[PDB]
Amino acid sequence: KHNMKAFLDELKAENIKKFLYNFTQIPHLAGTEQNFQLAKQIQSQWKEFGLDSVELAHYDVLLSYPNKTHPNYISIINEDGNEIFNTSLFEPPPPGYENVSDIVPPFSAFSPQGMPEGDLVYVNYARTEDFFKLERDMKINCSGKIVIARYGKVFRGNKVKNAQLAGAKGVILYSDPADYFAPGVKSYPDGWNLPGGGVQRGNILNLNGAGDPLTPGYPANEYAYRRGIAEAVGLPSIPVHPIGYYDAQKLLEKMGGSAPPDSSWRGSLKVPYNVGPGFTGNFSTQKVKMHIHSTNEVTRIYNVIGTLRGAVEPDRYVILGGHRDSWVFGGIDPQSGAAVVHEIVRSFGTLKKEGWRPRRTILFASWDAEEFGLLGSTEWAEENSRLLQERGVAYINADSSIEGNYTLRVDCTPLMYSLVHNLTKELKSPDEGFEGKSLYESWTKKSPSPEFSGMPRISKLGSGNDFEVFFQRLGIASGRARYTKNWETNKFSGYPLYHSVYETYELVEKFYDPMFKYHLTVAQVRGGMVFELANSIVLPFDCRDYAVVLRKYADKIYSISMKHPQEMKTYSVSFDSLFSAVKNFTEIASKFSERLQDFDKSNPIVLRMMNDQLMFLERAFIDPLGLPDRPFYRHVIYAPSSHNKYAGESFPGIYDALFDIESKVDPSKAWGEVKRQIYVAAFTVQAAAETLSEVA
Amino acid sequence: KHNMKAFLDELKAENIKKFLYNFTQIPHLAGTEQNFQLAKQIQSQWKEFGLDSVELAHYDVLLSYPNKTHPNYISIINEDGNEIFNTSLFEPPPPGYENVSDIVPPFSAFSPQGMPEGDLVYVNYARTEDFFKLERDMKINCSGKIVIARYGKVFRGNKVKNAQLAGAKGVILYSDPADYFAPGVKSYPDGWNLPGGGVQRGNILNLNGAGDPLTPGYPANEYAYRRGIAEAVGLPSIPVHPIGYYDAQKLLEKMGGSAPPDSSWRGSLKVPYNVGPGFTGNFSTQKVKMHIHSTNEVTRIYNVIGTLRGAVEPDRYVILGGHRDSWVFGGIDPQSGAAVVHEIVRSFGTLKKEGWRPRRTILFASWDAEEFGLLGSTEWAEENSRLLQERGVAYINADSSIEGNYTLRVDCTPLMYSLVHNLTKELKSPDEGFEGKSLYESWTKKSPSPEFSGMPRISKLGSGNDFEVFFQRLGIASGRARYTKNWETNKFSGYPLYHSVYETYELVEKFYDPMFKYHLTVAQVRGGMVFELANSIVLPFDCRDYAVVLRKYADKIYSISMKHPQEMKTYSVSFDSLFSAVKNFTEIASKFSERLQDFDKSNPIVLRMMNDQLMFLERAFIDPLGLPDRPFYRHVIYAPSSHNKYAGESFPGIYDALFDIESKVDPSKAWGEVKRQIYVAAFTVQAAAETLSEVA
Ligand SMILES: *[C@@H]1O[C@H](CO)[C@@H](O[C@@H]2O[C@H](CO)[C@@H](O[C@@H]3O[C@H](CO[C@H]4O[C@H](CO)[C@@H](O)[C@H](O)[C@@H]4O)[C@@H](O)[C@H](O[C@H]4O[C@H](CO)[C@@H](O)[C@H](O)[C@@H]4O)[C@@H]3O)[C@H](O)[C@H]2NC(C)=O)[C@H](O)[C@H]1NC(C)=O
Ligand SMILES: *[C@@H]1O[C@H](CO)[C@@H](O[C@@H]2O[C@H](CO)[C@@H](O[C@@H]3O[C@H](CO[C@H]4O[C@H](CO)[C@@H](O)[C@H](O)[C@@H]4O)[C@@H](O)[C@H](O[C@H]4O[C@H](CO)[C@@H](O)[C@H](O)[C@@H]4O)[C@@H]3O)[C@H](O)[C@H]2NC(C)=O)[C@H](O)[C@H]1NC(C)=O
Ligand SMILES: *[C@@H]1O[C@H](CO)[C@@H](O[C@@H]2O[C@H](CO)[C@@H](O[C@@H]3O[C@H](CO)[C@@H](O)[C@H](O)[C@@H]3O)[C@H](O)[C@H]2NC(C)=O)[C@H](O)[C@H]1NC(C)=O
Ligand SMILES: *[C@@H]1O[C@H](CO)[C@@H](O[C@@H]2O[C@H](CO)[C@@H](O[C@@H]3O[C@H](CO)[C@@H](O)[C@H](O)[C@@H]3O)[C@H](O)[C@H]2NC(C)=O)[C@H](O)[C@H]1NC(C)=O
Ligand SMILES: *[C@@H]1O[C@H](CO)[C@@H](O[C@@H]2O[C@H](CO)[C@@H](O[C@@H]3O[C@H](CO)[C@@H](O)[C@H](O)[C@@H]3O)[C@H](O)[C@H]2NC(C)=O)[C@H](O)[C@H]1NC(C)=O
Ligand SMILES: *[C@@H]1O[C@H](CO)[C@@H](O[C@@H]2O[C@H](CO)[C@@H](O[C@@H]3O[C@H](CO)[C@@H](O)[C@H](O)[C@@H]3O)[C@H](O)[C@H]2NC(C)=O)[C@H](O)[C@H]1NC(C)=O
Ligand SMILES: *[C@@H]1O[C@H](CO)[C@@H](O[C@@H]2O[C@H](CO)[C@@H](O[C@@H]3O[C@H](CO)[C@@H](O)[C@H](O)[C@@H]3O)[C@H](O)[C@H]2NC(C)=O)[C@H](O)[C@H]1NC(C)=O
Ligand SMILES: *[C@@H]1O[C@H](CO)[C@@H](O[C@@H]2O[C@H](CO)[C@@H](O[C@@H]3O[C@H](CO)[C@@H](O)[C@H](O)[C@@H]3O)[C@H](O)[C@H]2NC(C)=O)[C@H](O)[C@H]1NC(C)=O
Ligand SMILES: *[C@@H]1O[C@H](CO)[C@@H](O[C@@H]2O[C@H](CO)[C@@H](O)[C@H](O)[C@H]2NC(C)=O)[C@H](O)[C@H]1NC(C)=O
Ligand SMILES: *[C@@H]1O[C@H](CO)[C@@H](O[C@@H]2O[C@H](CO)[C@@H](O)[C@H](O)[C@H]2NC(C)=O)[C@H](O)[C@H]1NC(C)=O
Ligand SMILES: *[C@@H]1O[C@H](CO)[C@@H](O[C@@H]2O[C@H](CO)[C@@H](O)[C@H](O)[C@H]2NC(C)=O)[C@H](O)[C@H]1NC(C)=O
Ligand SMILES: *[C@@H]1O[C@H](CO)[C@@H](O[C@@H]2O[C@H](CO)[C@@H](O)[C@H](O)[C@H]2NC(C)=O)[C@H](O)[C@H]1NC(C)=O
Ligand SMILES: *[C@@H]1O[C@H](CO)[C@@H](O)[C@H](O)[C@H]1NC(C)=O
Ligand SMILES: *[C@@H]1O[C@H](CO)[C@@H](O)[C@H](O)[C@H]1NC(C)=O
Ligand SMILES: [Ca+2]
Ligand SMILES: [Ca+2]
Ligand SMILES: [Cl-]
Ligand SMILES: [Cl-]
Ligand SMILES: [Zn+2]
Ligand SMILES: [Zn+2]
Ligand SMILES: [Zn+2]
Ligand SMILES: [Zn+2]
């Protein structure tokens, strides 16, 4: 029998382990030779695994690298101009890698060059509300100051944007042990915590879905016409650099000026967490100096694209994609995901060698330059946009398979909720205490839905990964799954060794998943989703689940507006049209579901009409005009939060029109824009509903 | 037998005649009660003809009307402020209609209000090159002058835009007998020429595809949020009014200042055609005063939408659409087309009552407010955009069936060239001297292709009709056909009685088509196209015809650039990428054609893959970012000319980047934009080609 069970049983923990080891012995930084060689290896292996074609798709995109002979660092300087304290030039390498070459030192990718000198202001997490607190309540002016911010809570790019708009002349990012040192656990190599010399790499762009900064809208191919740097998308205007907490303690310990406004501003170091500006009396003439000499340069990147042609609907694509480029060894991010994809390809290929093909075509992708802004996935999607929007059934992401070892994490479109519930009921739980029980059962017990008893938590898709182009630009139903930590104790800043040199094969094998059972469970979830999407006769999407969430989101956004009852009266702000559209969607979706159950099962045209209606439903939520000042965020229901790229926001156009509205100087204009966004949302919901009506 | 022959034989000249009479006894101005009543009549009749459903789709859009108690007119005023000459308040009504109520007086729809006074400058046709001649060569400054321009050569909206940008404070449009009085033919009612009291109505918007000025992007439904007038799309800033040639002679006869630069500036009136500014010595203190009091107001409009559900592919739409609203009686425009649609619906309905259905769904549309900016078609398409872009096979327009009686006129996508050649070879010629010969033969003889011996002329689609949203915004294969005058003697300003009160049933019956044979031929062409598109197993599109034209257009645009060889050297401007893409398109299209011929004809999925590849080919030429500053013109190959909405331009983005480039102050920037447009075009052509490659 060639069925899902055969596919799933072929997957092996031991193969995932072997592949992870293979992928994490040297760094695979985007645009370097080592990552091209890995691309070529994966191409070769996918061909031997049995795929029909496997090609490299390359692009020439803007990347960023430190200058090897002019290192980045930060100083405290006295009034004479002597540098009395310098931050580290590199992370101490882990045991047995102290001779590995080409470890990129910590830096903030895409920082401009500069050597700004000034007084330090401490800005907590550099969130929108942190800056509101400084400027509006505490009356502290960041203009011309160097800000120091702790990592965590939001994407680092949003921190940098927020500091720029506050008038900062540079940003220092650091990892506080409050956020990256779990109590009771040892620092690497003796446990999974961040040492004081550890530093988190990461880009600080604000691309809003654009892809390569120089070529928004179009692939960065050989004849592409590039923007000049001054017109590039998303580059920061001020220098930025990340440090560890040993170094941060030295910059923070002398801070003076105002006390922290409350305890939510204090991390775990032995310093006051004074906001500044500047240092206490005895050190008041000392300053902080940054030295940033990184360079942006157009560099070639390589995606691997594998095809397993469908037997019946070869013009329908189900995509499994995840990235290959890493900051250093990529022990978790991304190779724990890449090894899972590799084993999925192997298992599908085993069935293929026995004569099986999926119903629909499956595309497998090893993306490049994800770490530098989702560049590889976005350029490929830009190149192939027409194929994807008319043929794209679904995209399943495959970055890190683990961020913890407690339970499952799923973020996806509502169209996949039913598919995920049904699949996880057929999979075995890997969890201690749930031997012989389903993954659905363990997941639901450990991560209960906040709404519905007996159901598990499934989150909105946010961003900060390679699904963004597919979901928020093109409107292709998308999802992701991985193992995670306890939601109850989750402080939402990720695992301690994120984007550090310490993220190694040994981290995973010793401390996260020694038996590779959580990896195997994630391979079964990702692979099983792909299998069902590519082989089910009727696409496994339930439109009724979108109806339920649309009502929840309408209730939410209405509740936000209702904090302003006087203005809603004055400006005649009604949500009636949106609730009407959501009611109609609910009714039409119910009727479509009945037909889908009842239609003549012998009629392949009626089936395809209904499969096309299902495929184009996510597509219907796209507005070709995009969201305000974010033309590549086109989905009307979901966009990455304007304050935090990692978080999904629902009804984003109305949300942003309402945000901080009490502060706008022209309320008539501001509430007019709220009404405009309500109209756009109600229209889009009704238009999406109508795609599920009888076609003629 | 229920085949195309049965459909075609059922069409009757005498029915078209009866319907034309029925539709032209009273005015049907958009937004008036009479046009709502006609909508309701056509709805009722299409239901009785046998359509499956027939509904009204209404919208509330910005329209424009004169003030009934404060008429528009133009004066010559002396230095005392006495009005010594006034233009007419209405056209003399034709025989037997002198008691018809509700004839809208001549006006320019969407003119603002005002009473500007000043000196007259005569600007020929108010084309871009006419203003270049005045400003650059003759050194005449239009700033603060009232300009007087003859109708013809270009859409009147482009004249108004050009006059505004020259600094005019008002525009007077008139019909010169050079352009609207055919030598040897009598004035109406004794022949088909424009009398001296006749005046051409028409809107003067510059909408660039937006639809209703207040709701760009979204349908003007009950909850729509409207722009304020100041932010509306496309409204003119200066007052405008049209007059006839009796009145124009009185304004032109006193003109002084500079002589006309050459004879291409002189029309046929007995005046010098002096450019001005102002009048000759004795009258130099006299001035011209406009009085415009029209009002813009949001008004309800009504489309009739009829459905004939497909038997096999009900989710594939073939649309036959034309408008119903008229300026006055609409004897030619639009009712000569509407009567043809009515008879087509009747004939399809006859087959349907006998048990036949087309393979694909046919939609029939009676659009409203076409005369005010393609408003009805565009709002409906905005509402139904998701359905149209995933299901829209083709759109066939059906405005005026005649603009002459000499031969056929076809403007369409290359995807329909083969369909049109094959259909016209099966139709009988109605022409004198071609009795017993095919329409293909008569058409080819009278209107030879300028490229290919033995083939007929087929033009690019321009704009100024209801196909614009479908073709240039949504990328649905579109076409139009009508009878026309001799191309050899055609001065390209249309028929003399265009948009005048004299365009009546009697005009058509006495002077254009007394036997309704040209109407019948046009019904056979439009109807036959719809039949084939809705019933052919394989869609009747030949991708190879696009390959041929893309090469022609690439050669053309290259030739334009090559007028600037030094700049192409300095800025390294290469067309190689575009020629490469066109070469690839040609190769891939040839291979697709082979497969289309060879694929297993028993396999409906392979057929639909290839029908979807054919349907989505026009769609592939759409750029979701649109053309520069024209977001609703998204087709990369074809847009309405920036200088003349009626004319199609090929590779419009590159064309506009090259236009007048020698005058730009920063050549580096200007040639950079040329290169950018070349990249966009080459990319789009290659991406469209790739949609025809094997799918996996
Ligand atoms: C959720 O789905 C429902 C349908 O199940 C939609 O209901 C429509 O709601 C609109 C209001 O937004 C109704 O609009 C009204 O239409 C009247 C004419 O309707 C008849 O004729 C049309 C042809 O034009 C037919 O299509 C229709 O079936 C009816 O036979 C107008 O006369 C109304 O305007 C008058 O009242 C309004 C309000 O006071 C005034 O502003 C006007 O000046 C005017 O006097 C109005 O336009 C429409 O009929 C409803 N369709 C139905 C029941 O089929 C909801 O719109 C939908 N929700 C969303 C968000 O789309
Ligand atoms: C019309 O259709 C043809 C194909 O029939 C397209 O041809 C491609 O043209 C591009 C040039 O625009 C070629 O690009 C070159 O690719 C080389 C690598 O190609 C190999 O490996 C890739 C995987 O990455 C495979 O997909 C491919 O099949 C080959 O095996 C690069 O090494 C080249 O870059 C080098 O040279 C250039 C030029 O001097 C330098 O600028 C670089 O710095 C570098 O040294 C280059 O990128 C591509 O291989 C061709 N594909 C083929 C033949 O299949 C045309 O592009 C297409 N026209 C348009 C407009 O799309
Ligand atoms: C990760 O796994 C891959 C795949 O197994 C390893 O690459 C493979 O390495 C072997 C040994 O170097 C290569 O075989 C050799 O080929 C040459 C001749 O071409 C010959 O001199 C040797 O005797 C041997 O046959 C093999 O080609 C290569 N395969 C691919 C697809 O790249 C890789 O070494 C592993 N990496 C790590 C860090 O473990
Ligand atoms: C932090 O790092 C900086 C930069 O490396 C250190 O400052 C640098 O110190 C060196 C060595 O003392 C200086 O070079 C010397 O300059 C003198 C005077 O011109 C000259 O006599 C020597 O031959 C040599 O060239 C260098 O100028 C100085 N650079 C800067 C930018 O200040 C600093 O010592 C480090 N601080 C700590 C605490 O480690
Ligand atoms: C997830 O699993 C559930 C439970 O199996 C699936 O729902 C079930 O889907 C089947 C169709 O295979 C429904 O069966 C139908 O029953 C009706 C009679 O009520 C009959 O008209 C049809 O001929 C057919 O036998 C079944 O009712 C339904 N059960 C529910 C909703 O509780 C669900 O479709 C799966 N989701 C996927 C595949 O995305
Ligand atoms: C254009 O053609 C249409 C359709 O033939 C004409 O409308 C039709 O006019 C007749 C006569 O007025 C209507 O029938 C009448 O109905 C009422 C009762 O409802 C009754 O009092 C009369 O004895 C007679 O039966 C008919 O309903 C109407 N049909 C439609 C669909 O509107 C129209 O008059 C023609 N217009 C011109 C200018 O010739
Ligand atoms: C062109 O049309 C205009 C506007 O209708 C004509 O000018 C108007 O002439 C009337 C009748 O003479 C004027 O009304 C009268 O005004 C006088 C003085 O205040 C008063 O004694 C009368 O009882 C009556 O109200 C009117 O003011 C004047 N309007 C304007 C705007 O100038 C003009 O005569 C026409 N020219 C030709 C050649 O037909
Ligand atoms: C317009 O009419 C022409 C002439 O009939 C159509 O072209 C012809 O299309 C038929 C397919 O029905 C081609 O027949 C094929 O012949 C080849 C052998 O060369 C064979 O492999 C196939 O099984 C099939 O019999 C025929 O060659 C072709 N003639 C040409 C191009 O000269 C054309 O398709 C029509 N255009 C439409 C419908 O848009
Ligand atoms: C990286 O930093 C080095 C070292 O400071 C730069 O190389 C120097 O460049 C200057 C002029 O640009 C030369 O005069 C020096 O002799 C070079 N020094 C050495 C040691 O080679 C280099 O420009 C920087 N790389 C960049 C910007 O990519
Ligand atoms: C924060 O500090 C800056 C600079 O010290 C203030 O900006 C100055 O004030 C006005 C603009 O509002 C101009 O006259 C100056 O040119 C600005 N200076 C500079 C250096 O840009 C800013 O207004 C302060 N914000 C406060 C007090 O809220
Ligand atoms: C159309 O023109 C008429 C007549 O000049 C306007 O009606 C007058 O409006 C003013 C104030 O707006 C009144 O004081 C007059 O008594 C009205 N006159 C008459 C004869 O009714 C009317 O405003 C205009 N219509 C528009 C702008 O739609
Ligand atoms: C055409 O005429 C106008 C006005 O008579 C000129 O515009 C004036 O010149 C400059 C702007 O370039 C300003 O100082 C004045 O305020 C303008 N006047 C007005 C009324 O706008 C215009 O430059 C002339 N163009 C020529 C001679 O080419
Ligand atoms: C892995 O699971 C064990 C419990 O089996 C737990 O003690 C350990 O801390 C977990 N590792 C991580 C990194 O959370
Ligand atoms: C109609 O055709 C006749 C020739 O049969 C011609 O004399 C007449 O002018 C034509 N009418 C128009 C309006 O062109
Ligand atoms: Ca790009
Ligand atoms: Ca609109
Ligand atoms: Cl992921
Ligand atoms: Cl037409
Ligand atoms: Zn990653
Ligand atoms: Zn990462
Ligand atoms: Zn018309
Ligand atoms: Zn017209």
Side-chain angles (χ1 to χ4, degrees), chain A residues 59 61 210-221 224 375 378-380 382-383 473, chain B residues 679:
Chain A
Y59 307 93
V61 301
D212 169 44
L214 303 185
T215 58
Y218 310 94
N221 62 24
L375 307 182
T378 306
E379 295 306 304
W380 185 86
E382 290 183 323
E383 196 167 65
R473 195 200 294 202
Chain B
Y679 160 56

Side-chain angles (χ1 to χ4, degrees), chain B residues 6-17:
Chain B
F7 166 75
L8 292 172
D9 286 347
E10 181 61 41
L11 301 165
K12 301 304 195 271
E14 184 67 26
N15 289 330
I16 302 166
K17 180 176 185 186

Side-chain angles (χ1 to χ4, degrees), chain B residues 85-303:
Chain B
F85 164 72
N86 292 330
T87 63
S88 82
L89 301 188
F90 60 93
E91 293 178 280
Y97 295 87
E98 309 96 334
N99 197 53
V100 174
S101 52
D102 304 312
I103 293 169
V104 78
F107 73 120
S108 295
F110 305 97
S111 181
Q113 295 178 354
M115 292 187 296
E117 292 180 41
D119 301 330
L120 207 48
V121 172
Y122 165 68
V123 302
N124 202 21
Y125 298 107
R127 299 167 299 181
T128 295
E129 60 268 32
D130 297 322
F131 282 103
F132 281 167
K133 175 138 276 155
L134 287 167
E135 186 186 283
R136 299 171 171 188
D137 304 339
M138 304 180 83
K139 319 290 184 187
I140 284 152
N141 188 347
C142 294
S143 179
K145 305 294 197 275
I146 292 177
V147 304
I148 181 157
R150 53 174 172 166
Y151 270 132
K153 305 302 181 185
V154 304
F155 173 61
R156 71 186 79 73
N158 290 97
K159 300 176 191 272
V160 169
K161 179 179 164 171
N162 296 163
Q164 284 170 186
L165 297 180
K169 73 177 175 179
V171 181
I172 301 173
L173 299 164
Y174 84 93
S175 302
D176 198 288
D179 309 290
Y180 298 98
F181 195 96
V185 171
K186 288 316 195 170
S187 285
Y188 200 73
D190 303 314
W192 49 270
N193 268 343
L194 187 65
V199 190
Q200 176 198 144
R201 287 157 192 75
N203 86 74
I204 52 165
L205 298 173
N206 286 274
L207 290 173
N208 294 324
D212 169 44
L214 303 185
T215 58
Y218 310 94
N221 62 24
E222 280 275 3
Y223 57 88
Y225 186 77
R226 297 183 167 76
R227 294 187 173 193
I229 282 282
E231 289 71 44
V233 180
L235 305 177
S237 63
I238 57 180
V240 182
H241 192 69
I243 67 181
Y245 55 87
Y246 291 158
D247 285 340
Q249 182 150 176
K250 297 279 166 163
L251 298 183
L252 296 169
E253 69 188 3
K254 295 167 170 182
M255 290 202 52
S258 305
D262 64 67
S263 72
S264 71
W265 283 58
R266 285 191 184 99
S268 292
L269 300 167
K270 301 294 152 184
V271 297
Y273 291 95
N274 289 330
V275 168
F279 295 143
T280 58
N282 297 347
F283 312 107
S284 72
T285 63
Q286 299 179 349
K287 286 187 207 293
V288 171
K289 187 172 183 160
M290 306 181 71
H291 321 249
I292 309 303
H293 311 293
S294 299
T295 60
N296 295 329
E297 44 203 50
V298 173
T299 308
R300 188 155 292 187
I301 65 164
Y302 303 88
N303 300 324

Side-chain angles (χ1 to χ4, degrees), chain A residues 248-280:
Chain A
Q249 182 150 176
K250 297 279 166 163
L251 298 183
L252 296 169
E253 69 188 3
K254 295 167 170 182
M255 290 202 52
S258 305
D262 64 67
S263 72
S264 71
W265 283 58
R266 285 191 184 99
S268 292
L269 300 167
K270 301 294 152 184
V271 297
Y273 291 95
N274 289 330
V275 168
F279 295 143
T280 58

Side-chain angles (χ1 to χ4, degrees), chain B residues 276-473:
Chain B
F279 295 143
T280 58
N282 297 347
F283 312 107
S284 72
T285 63
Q286 299 179 349
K287 286 187 207 293
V288 171
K289 187 172 183 160
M290 306 181 71
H291 321 249
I292 309 303
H293 311 293
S294 299
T295 60
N296 295 329
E297 44 203 50
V298 173
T299 308
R300 188 155 292 187
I301 65 164
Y302 303 88
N303 300 324
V304 188
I305 309 293
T307 301
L308 183 52
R309 176 177 26 87
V312 179
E313 296 187 271
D315 73 335
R316 295 283 175 266
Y317 306 147
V318 174
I319 304 166
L320 179 64
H323 77 105
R324 185 185 68 256
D325 68 297
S326 60
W327 278 115
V328 192
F329 302 100
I332 289 174
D333 184 2
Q335 309 305 349
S336 69
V340 157
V341 175
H342 217 49
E343 181 64 351
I344 289 163
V345 174
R346 193 195 65 74
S347 176
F348 279 122
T350 290
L351 280 66
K352 193 253 207 173
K353 287 170 180 188
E354 296 176 5
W356 172 86
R357 281 189 176 283
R359 179 186 171 85
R360 305 182 179 79
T361 287
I362 307 169
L363 304 181
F364 300 97
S366 176
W367 307 127
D368 206 347
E370 184 277 353
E371 297 292 11
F372 287 84
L374 318 181
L375 307 182
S377 60
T378 306
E379 295 306 304
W380 185 86
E382 290 183 323
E383 196 167 65
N384 296 105
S385 64
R386 295 149 183 80
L387 306 184
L388 292 172
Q389 72 194 184
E390 309 305 356
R391 301 177 192 169
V393 168
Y395 177 88
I396 301 299
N397 208 56
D399 199 359
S400 305
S401 295
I402 45 155
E403 61 187 34
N405 66 6
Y406 184 74
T407 193
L408 195 66
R409 163 176 183 173
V410 180
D411 310 357
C412 64
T413 174
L415 292 178
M416 292 175 194
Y417 290 169
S418 195
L419 167 63
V420 170
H421 290 165
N422 289 3
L423 174 60
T424 60
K425 284 166 187 186
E426 299 299 319
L427 297 176
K428 294 198 250 284
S429 177
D431 296 2
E432 184 169 47
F434 291 87
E435 294 80 7
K437 306 309 181 58
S438 76
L439 181 55
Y440 182 92
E441 183 173 323
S442 67
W443 178 30
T444 294
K445 176 57 168 186
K446 288 177 174 189
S447 214
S449 159
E451 300 138 13
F452 303 102
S453 274
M455 235 96 100
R457 184 178 285 275
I458 301 181
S459 293
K460 296 193 287 280
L461 284 162
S463 187
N465 222 295
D466 285 311
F467 59 81
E468 190 190 63
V469 71
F470 298 97
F471 192 58
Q472 333 274 180
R473 195 200 294 202

